[PDB]
Amino acid sequence: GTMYYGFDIGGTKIEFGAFDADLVRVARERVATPTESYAAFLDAIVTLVNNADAEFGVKGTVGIGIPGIADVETGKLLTSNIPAAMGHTLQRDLEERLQRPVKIENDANCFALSEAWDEDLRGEPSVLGLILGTGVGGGLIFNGKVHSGRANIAGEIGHTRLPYDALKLLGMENAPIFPCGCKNSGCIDNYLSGRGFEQLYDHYFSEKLSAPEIIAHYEQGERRAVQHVERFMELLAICLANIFTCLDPHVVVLGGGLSNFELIYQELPKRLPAHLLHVAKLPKIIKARHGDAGGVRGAAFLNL
Amino acid sequence: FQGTMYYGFDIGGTKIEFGAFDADLVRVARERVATPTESYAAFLDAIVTLVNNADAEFGVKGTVGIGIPGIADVETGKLLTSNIPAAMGHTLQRDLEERLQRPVKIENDANCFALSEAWDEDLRGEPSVLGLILGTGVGGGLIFNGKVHSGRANIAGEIGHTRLPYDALKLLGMENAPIFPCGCKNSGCIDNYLSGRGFEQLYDHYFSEKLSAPEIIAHYEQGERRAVQHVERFMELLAICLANIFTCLDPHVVVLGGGLSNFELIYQELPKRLPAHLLHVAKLPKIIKARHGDAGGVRGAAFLNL
Ligand SMILES: Nc1ncnc2c1ncn2[C@@H]1O[C@H](COP(=O)(O)OP(=O)(O)O)[C@@H](O)[C@H]1O
Ligand SMILES: Nc1ncnc2c1ncn2[C@@H]1O[C@H](COP(=O)(O)OP(=O)(O)O)[C@@H](O)[C@H]1O
Ligand SMILES: CC(=O)N[C@@H]1[C@@H](O)[C@H](O)[C@@H](CO)O[C@@H]1O
Ligand SMILES: CC(=O)N[C@@H]1[C@@H](O)[C@H](O)[C@@H](CO)O[C@@H]1O
Ligand SMILES: [K+]
Ligand SMILES: [K+]
Ligand SMILES: [Zn+2]
Ligand SMILES: [Zn+2]
Ligand SMILES: [Zn+2]
């Protein structure tokens, strides 16, 4: 008999949801992520909670999915695509402002948790939730339970470096080596995300187009976009084949902005086998069943 | 009467190790034979003989669990085992079930190792354990909340067949880096770099002499120039590659097994070198040498049948 709030915080947008005691979604809000000012970042979150509390006449529970890691010892955030939040004790800061406990979990973990709880995936021995947004994130579920890892880093596939076969595709010593918000270089976060898709286009063609614009040019059969999409589909297959040789997930669920690129679901099953072991069988690869809400739902229900 | 007996096999490229464990799980037999490398019939014979002999010795029909490098196809049961040429492409489980007239369980070697190591009372309650074999190849066994994740197609933990990451290539000279062919038929898999065999191949690549890992390590201990250069390069390469793996898996405990796990310097150097390549907020896992020595494979295989 509560109200449960969830936040799904990404590099560019914050999604907010409120769910009643029967878990029905009764609020839905979206705001831009403040990426520069930490004060503005906190304000955005606090406003949404306060507004919802005023609307429903309650003090809602607060679960937040963050695009990054709260240090397991200090609580300070590493959010590679949110400069504003870097180094701050988000949980503590919010508990102060909102005068109640706050649970923080990684965004991809929340997404994976929600998607794995779907009746269709109940009973699957493993599920990998993959977010391809401003960054690349993974949530690892084994027998229905999240593996969050020794230091809340499990599933941080975005901060693994391009594998040799991917570098080969991109031209080896001539490959674009993109800087990462984690301060490393060549992290796949900057290649397979919708942002990375854009950066790869710009690197090869010297024009700053959005992912939806490139995809639209692709749909028209425009030469540069067709070349870009071929390169990207192969890069995606190579990188995910490496990850699947380590993790071998039963089901892979894709979320984030770039998960709306329908071609991915056609091309991945065709391109993965060449890069997997000979006896590998493909995982079930599906688009998010909860649309754009799995992160919010996962976050909200941390307080269940 | 003897009671229930559990047999385990650790099948390697050169030798087959057998163990029989009684109902109290005490090891009461230990046998080692050459791995038949050509004839599959000879391979099966070696295994069947050990089971039959042990059965005759103890007056029982023991359960049979087998650890082997490579993968039994999840659909066909055919083995993908590049390092066991005799068994490649064969339905080992079915063939043995016919010969031995009882069920046979087949598991990956690194999975067996991880299962045995994680069952230790001190690890049994850890939220995750990664068993890593550094031997002729590089293999991983992934345990989450005390249960092995064997994966969609029995491939979970095949970290040896992931390709060198960019930061590792950079260390090795990028377009001038040695790109070793792999038994899986890919190129640049870490199986051929971080294993004891890989350690040797890297030495040979840079120095053109085919020394064994123990020879190189002994030269290193004497401060010989080439070995010192090799070991520095290798320690950094190992840290880079494992940092990539740990950023994906973030294991609570990592247990090292296989021949190269005997190189003690690894346990000193990894904690020093990993942080630079991990995320800023990463905390190191507990990194330990195998608590069961060279026996975790046999024990893990035997106890598949517990
Ligand atoms: N329908 C779409 N098709 C393809 N790419 C999209 C689509 N919507 C958003 N994107 C891209 O996804 C990225 C943004 O990721 P998203 O998950 O929306 O949020 P966040 O920035 O919070 O991670 C951008 O590259 C954006 O252009
Ligand atoms: N004590 C040791 N110190 C260092 N390396 C070792 C040691 N013993 C074996 N090795 C190396 O480990 C590799 C052998 O792998 P091992 O685990 O013995 O068998 P398998 O071939 O079944 O994996 C070889 O490179 C060997 O030289
Ligand atoms: C260290 C870091 O910032 N990682 C985040 C990751 O947690 C998140 O899941 C992903 C997608 O939003 O983007 C980033 O890679
Ligand atoms: C595909 C293949 O042969 N992989 C094996 C792996 O199963 C084993 O665990 C590892 C260590 O023995 O060596 C190889 O990497
Ligand atoms: K994660
Ligand atoms: K394995
Ligand atoms: Zn990074
Ligand atoms: Zn390989
Ligand atoms: Zn010598």
TrEMBL record, chain A:
Family annotation (InterPro entries): ATPase_NBD, N-acetyl-D-glucosamine_kinase, ROK, ROK_cs
Sample GO molecular function, one term: zinc ion binding
Binding site residues for Zn(2+): 159, 180, 182, 187
SUPFAM superfamilies to which the protein is assigned, alphabetical: Actin-like ATPase domain
Catalytic activity, as annotated: N-acetyl-D-glucosamine + ATP = N-acetyl-D-glucosamine 6-phosphate + ADP + H(+)
Binding locations of Zn(2+) 1: 159, 180, 182, 187
Biological process terms in GO annotation: N-acetylglucosamine metabolic process; peptidoglycan turnover
E.C. no: 2.7.1.59
Binding site for ATP: 6-13, 135-142
Gene3D superfamilies the UniProt entry points to: 3.30.420.40
Membrane-spanning segments: none
Binding site for N-acetyl-alpha-D-glucosamine: 68, 80, 106-107, 156, 159, 189
Purpose of the protein: Catalyzes the phosphorylation of N-acetyl-D-glucosamine (GlcNAc) derived from cell-wall degradation, yielding GlcNAc-6-P.
Family: Belongs to the ROK (NagC/XylR) family. NagK subfamily.
The protein, known as: N-acetyl-D-glucosamine kinase
Native source organism of the sequence: Plesiomonas shigelloides 302-73
Gene name of this polypeptide: nagK
UniProtKB/TrEMBL annotation, chain B:
Single Gene Ontology BP annotation: peptidoglycan turnover
Pfam families: ROK
Chain residues that bind Zn(2+) 1: 161, 182, 184, 189
Alphabetical keyword list: ATP-binding, Carbohydrate metabolism, Kinase, Metal-binding, Nucleotide-binding, Transferase, Zinc
Keyword Transmembrane helix: no
Binding of Zn(2+) 2, residues: 215, 219
Reaction equation(s) it catalyzes: N-acetyl-D-glucosamine + ATP = N-acetyl-D-glucosamine 6-phosphate + ADP + H(+)
InterPro entries for the chain: ATPase_NBD, N-acetyl-D-glucosamine_kinase, ROK, ROK_cs
Residues annotated for ATP binding in this entry: 8-15, 137-144
Transmembrane segments: none
Pathway stated in the Swiss-Prot or TrEMBL entry: Cell wall biogenesis; peptidoglycan recycling
UniProt: N-acetyl-alpha-D-glucosamine binding residues: 70, 82, 108-109, 158, 161, 191
UniProt: ADP binding residues: 14-15, 136, 200, 259
MF annotations from Gene Ontology: ATP binding; N-acetylglucosamine kinase activity; zinc ion binding
Family: Belongs to the ROK (NagC/XylR) family. NagK subfamily.
PANTHER family, alphabetized: N-ACETYL-D-GLUCOSAMINE KINASE (PTHR18964:SF162), ROK (REPRESSOR, ORF, KINASE) FAMILY (PTHR18964)
Role played: Catalyzes the phosphorylation of N-acetyl-D-glucosamine (GlcNAc) derived from cell-wall degradation, yielding GlcNAc-6-P.
Protein name in UniProt: N-acetyl-D-glucosamine kinase
Organism: Plesiomonas shigelloides 302-73
Gene name in the database record: nagK
